Design a protein around this ligand. Structure first.
Ligand code: MSS
Ligand code: MSS
Lengths: 343, 345
């Protein structure tokens, strides 16, 4: 399920009912939400390992933060567009609609691990396991949705039970989700049933070989970069198609992943000339996105609207993103251009 | 048809979900068909150098602004005034506790941009006067029923003509297709389905401005020499937990705002205001007109606690224990009355 450009709005926050849905496996039954507070999470790799219920988690702390939830596959269509000859690429051909900015609320993982005496000596990763039932007999490593991120993320990770002021839906990973701000969608583990502080990455297929950045025709392997930190990115959201001659408000969303978006330039002529856009609305912090807008006075014609964001570390979107075989992490400014017909 | 939000339904994400947001109308709602063609909705702009009627489509060309505000009825907390009546004293109106309030993100065009595009306000303009889009009964005195409100023109730079709330087109319940939003001002001033915005030399003399929504003593009539319900005062309340908890660690949370000013700090007491501790803010700061979530991490023995919060704004205005009585029961902001009784077992 992919969001259309008109549906992002300009309120920063993406409506929960329009937020994209992506699952690697079939979803659990909705009955896991019957008793949200009774959902159990096994916490290990800490000094005092224990299973805690969501009711217990709710006693330990409270944190609220906005992040950009974006599939590593967002923009895959734009990689497929660059294929030539016999070159092939499988996977969902997302354009820009596998992304939203949402507000999570829950308990800091740091508060949970501290209540259990802190991480075990030598821990280097946070490893979260999805709560889906695995089919009996088969090697669960082949199907389990289990991801590892560096333990440097500990102070930012949230075990969230709420999003945009509502209890977390099944579609978005209720009753509890491991949120890793600034990291690609796959790392944000839905219906999280275990969190382990580990010395090594999980060897689950979804970590070891899937979700790796490699050349076309190469297999994924664990020496290659995983889809972890999200790169600087933006796109135009409005007007998504049309306007009338004269003043037009051009707007979109921009983010720096782990870093704040510092500035955004907008072009109406496919990147031949650029102008600085203004940020619109409140700043929800470095892991969220900003709305930006440029006022332009346009004659009747067909414009090519593009946006180019820079983060606080000086990372800037390229015109086109280097190819990788599975089509992860697109952040180019040319491919997501909006054709604006001005009447 | 009113809808009051339950304490359990505010959440701790700052933003109040649209489907939980309270509903209050002074008259019947217009039909759903006014949303069929949102972009064709017309707004008459007057009291400017070049007056004209603009459609929502035209308004959308002139600017873009996004801002969070606390939308709260002047009547929120009226129950707490009714609880203080003695003897023969009476007070009509909806007995809201704390649920006639939410924090929402609006998006639309700044009224300043609209006014600037039409050559600025006419010399001598003193008020911004918005007229609701409801149909009025034919041949009856429209002043008696029209939802028309005037606020000082000092609000010009803050006012938004909003077509969107919380990332979606504004619903009928919350004043689509276009709403005049007056940040920091009481709910009544945030005119739904706004069909006219006038920069006027005087307040409207519509009943709902002249004599309703005035602050007066019990047994007095409303009159235009009295303060109108305009700026909303510093306020907070506890939202969670709402009834029971287990002994041990308890996260006590709520919402706090300063109205025209940001909330700077919040104190929380678990013993009915005898002892206070400073709470922490939770989540991002959505600006001076929004509310903050706050929380206190408490460690509680078995017993019956009385949870209260006391907010201070950036200018040193602090909530009183009790709010001075007024006859229509507007603007309650006391910390004692909205206490949560928490049974810890
Ligand atoms: N448990 C789990 N979790 C999980 C999953 C699954 O399947 N399971 N998926 C992923 C992905 S992959 Mo690609 O990188 S994007 C993504 C995300 C999505 O989310 P939403 O649906 O809520 O939107 O999630 C995440 N998480
Ligand atoms: N047009 C119009 N608007 C309007 C109206 C009516 O009736 N009409 N109401 C008021 C009031 S009053 Mo007392 O101060 S509160 C209030 C508000 C509400 O909102 P929601 O329903 O959305 O919540 O609105 C406002 N606006």
């Amino acid at each position: 399920l992919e969001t259309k450009r008109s549906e992002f709005g300009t309120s920063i926050i993406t409506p929960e009912e329009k937020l994209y849905i992506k699952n690697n496996v079939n979803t659990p039954p909705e009955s896991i939400l019957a008793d949200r507070d009774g959902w159990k999470v096994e916490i290990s790799g800490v000094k005092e390992p224990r299973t805690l219920t969501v009711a217990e988690l709710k006693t330990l702390g409270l944190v609220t933060a906005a992040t950009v939830l974006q599939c590593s596959g967002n923009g895959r269509k734009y990689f497929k567009d660059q294929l030539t000859g016999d070159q092939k690429m499988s996977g969902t051909p997302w354009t820009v609609g596998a992304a939203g900015c949402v507000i999570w609320s829950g308990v800091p993982l740091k508060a949970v691990v501290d209540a259990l005496g802190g991480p075990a000596e030598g821990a280097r990763f946070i490893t979260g396991t999805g709560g889906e039932e695995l089919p009996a007999g088969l090697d669960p490593k082949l199907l389990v949705v289990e991801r590892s991120v560096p333990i440097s993320n500990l102070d930012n990770v949230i075990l969230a039970w709420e999003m945009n002021g509502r209890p977390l839906s099944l579609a978005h990973g209720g009753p509890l989700r491991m949120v890793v701000p600034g990291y690609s969608g796959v790392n944000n583990i839905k219906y999280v049933k275990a969190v382990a502080m580990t010395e090594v990455e999980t060897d689950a297929k979804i970590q070891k070989t899937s979700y790796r950045v490699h050349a076309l025709g190469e297999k994924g392997s664990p020496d290659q970069p995983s889809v972890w930190e999200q790169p600087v990115k933006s796109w135009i959201t409005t007007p998504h198609e049309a306007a009338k001659a004269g003043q037009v408000q051009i707007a979109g969303v921009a983010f720096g992943g782990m870093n704040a978006c510092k500035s955004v330039e907008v072009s109406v002529d496919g990147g031949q000339t650029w102008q600085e856009a203004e940020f619109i609305g409140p700043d929800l912090g470095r892991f969220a996105w900003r709305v930006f807008a440029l006022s332009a006075d346009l004659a009747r014609g067909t414009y090519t609207l593009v946006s180019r964001a820079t983060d606080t570390e000086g990372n800037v979107q390229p015109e086109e993103t280097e190819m990788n075989g599975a089509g992860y992490g697109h952040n180019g400014w040319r491919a997501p251009a909006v054709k604006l017909t001005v009447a």
